[PDB]
């Protein structure tokens, strides 16, 4: 078996390698990146996502979001408050100020510590999950707003033609700016460029141990798990390492940087901070692989998770038992 430990592995393709994304993942898991939950793809020298971000500023965030966190410093929710519109230029400078900036740190690993110690305290403000795509039209390869959708590969793999489109988002973050502990919507793969700006910290826990974190957090939540036998799709809950050190959690953590792809994988847990203001944008995609994944997802019927219209047939063709219940959760 490859990767039997399952450490994030990093890939660096050449040019032509990077021509066929699906065959790339592939090959990526026929080396067992995907026993790990997380990889990070170096994309070659020669590739660019667009020519430059000069002219991003007038971008508009409708609704961003401000991460209140309750709880210990090791192990707390956060709600999101939401604030008025602003602009990416805006956002931009609030980042920037002296009440949100990065703090003076030596490395990562102080950073980092500096993370886990102080977040509770700040309220730090995420442009988070606004679609659109900043690749250019022009960029060929790994173009996040040009891969198979979906819709297409169900329908490839099992026949069944469905309703559904499957479009990127873009994040704009800023110190301190959180993404709670996750999988994806029907477990899917989620693929994320940082096109500019500050790194980004990620946790992961292998997929074949999931299982292990989501008992932890039953334990560490015990009244969120009491309302909702999935609550980890609300995407509100913050374990850190430490804690799940002393609980022996088995997970890897990476820091990916501007430039940089990093792809998660289905069942997959991840979380993780920002460093600083940055942009990132994501998709979530399918392989043939996905496809028991998606039939075994748990899901949120509570009524909290809310998501999206593309969500419906998935849960309506992999898992028509549930669909009903799931359904009345999203009404
Ligand atoms: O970057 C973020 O805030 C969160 N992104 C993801 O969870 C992802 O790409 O799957
Ligand atoms: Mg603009
Ligand atoms: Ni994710
Ligand atoms: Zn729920």
């Given at each position: 078996?490859?990767?039997?430990?399952?450490?994030?592995?990093?890939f660096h393709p050449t040019k032509?390698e990077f021509?066929?994304?699906?065959?790339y993942?592939?090959?990526?898991?026929?080396?067992?990146?995907?026993?790990?939950?997380?990889?990070?793809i170096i994309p070659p020298?020669?590739?660019?996502?667009?020519?430059?971000?000069?002219?991003?500023?007038?971008?508009?965030?409708?609704?961003?979001?401000?991460?209140?966190?309750?709880?210990?410093?090791?192990?707390?929710?956060?709600?999101?408050?939401?604030?008025?519109?602003?602009?990416?230029?805006?956002?931009?400078?609030?980042?920037?100020?002296?009440?949100?900036?990065?703090?003076?740190?030596?490395?990562?690993?102080?950073?980092?510590?500096?993370?886990?110690?102080?977040?509770?305290?700040?309220?730090?403000?995420?442009?988070?999950?606004?679609?659109?795509?900043?690749?250019?039209?022009?960029?060929?390869?790994?173009?996040?707003?040009?891969?198979?959708?979906?819709?297409?590969?169900?329908?490839?793999?099992?026949?069944?033609?469905?309703?559904?489109?499957?479009?990127?988002?873009?994040?704009?973050?800023?110190?301190?700016?959180?993404?709670?502990?996750?999988?994806?919507?029907?477990?899917?793969?989620?693929?994320?460029?940082?096109?500019?700006?500050?790194?980004?910290?990620?946790?992961?826990?292998?997929?074949?141990?999931?299982?292990?974190?989501?008992?932890?957090?039953?334990?560490?939540?015990?009244?969120?798990?009491?309302?909702?036998?999935?609550?980890?799709?609300?995407?509100?809950?913050?374990?850190?390492?430490?804690?799940?050190?002393?609980?022996?959690?088995?997970?890897?953590?990476?820091?990916?940087?501007?430039?940089?792809?990093?792809?998660?994988?289905?069942?997959?847990?991840?979380?993780?901070?920002?460093?600083?203001?940055?942009?990132?944008?994501?998709?979530?995609?399918?392989?043939?692989?996905?496809?028991?994944?998606?039939?075994?997802?748990?899901?949120?019927?509570?009524?909290?998770?809310?998501?999206?219209?593309?969500?419906?047939?998935?849960?309506?063709?992999?898992?028509?038992?549930?669909?009903?219940?799931?359904?009345?959760?999203?009404?």
């Amino acid at each position: 078996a490859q990767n039997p430990n399952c450490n994030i592995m990093i890939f660096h393709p050449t040019k032509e390698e990077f021509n066929d994304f699906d065959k790339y993942i592939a090959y990526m898991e026929s080396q067992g990146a995907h026993r790990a939950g997380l990889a990070k793809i170096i994309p070659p020298k020669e590739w660019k996502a667009r020519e430059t971000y000069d002219n991003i500023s007038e971008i508009l965030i409708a609704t961003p979001l401000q991460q209140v966190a309750s709880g210990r410093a090791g192990v707390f929710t956060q709600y999101h408050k939401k604030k008025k519109a602003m602009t990416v230029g805006e956002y931009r400078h609030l980042a920037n100020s002296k009440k949100y900036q990065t703090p003076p740190h030596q490395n990562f690993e102080d950073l980092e510590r500096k993370y886990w110690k102080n977040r509770i305290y700040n309220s730090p403000i995420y442009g988070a999950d606004i679609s659109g795509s900043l690749f250019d039209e022009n960029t060929k390869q790994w173009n996040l707003g040009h891969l198979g959708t979906i819709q297409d590969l169900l329908e490839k793999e099992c026949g069944v033609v469905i309703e559904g489109v499957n479009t990127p988002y873009l994040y704009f973050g800023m110190w301190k700016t959180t993404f709670a502990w996750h999988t994806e919507d029907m477990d899917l793969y989620s693929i994320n460029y940082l096109h500019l700006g500050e790194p980004k910290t990620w946790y992961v826990v292998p997929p074949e141990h999931g299982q292990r974190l989501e008992r932890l957090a039953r334990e560490l939540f015990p009244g969120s798990s009491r309302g909702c036998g999935a609550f980890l799709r609300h995407k509100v809950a913050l374990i850190s390492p430490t804690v799940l050190k002393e609980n022996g959690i088995p997970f890897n953590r990476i820091t990916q940087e501007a430039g940089e792809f990093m792809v998660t994988f289905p069942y997959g847990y991840h979380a993780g901070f920002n460093h600083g203001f940055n942009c990132a944008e994501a998709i979530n995609f399918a392989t043939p692989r996905w496809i028991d994944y998606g039939k075994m997802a748990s899901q949120c019927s509570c009524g909290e998770a809310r998501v999206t219209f593309s969500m419906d047939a998935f849960v309506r063709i992999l898992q028509p038992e549930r669909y009903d219940l799931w359904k009345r959760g999203q009404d």
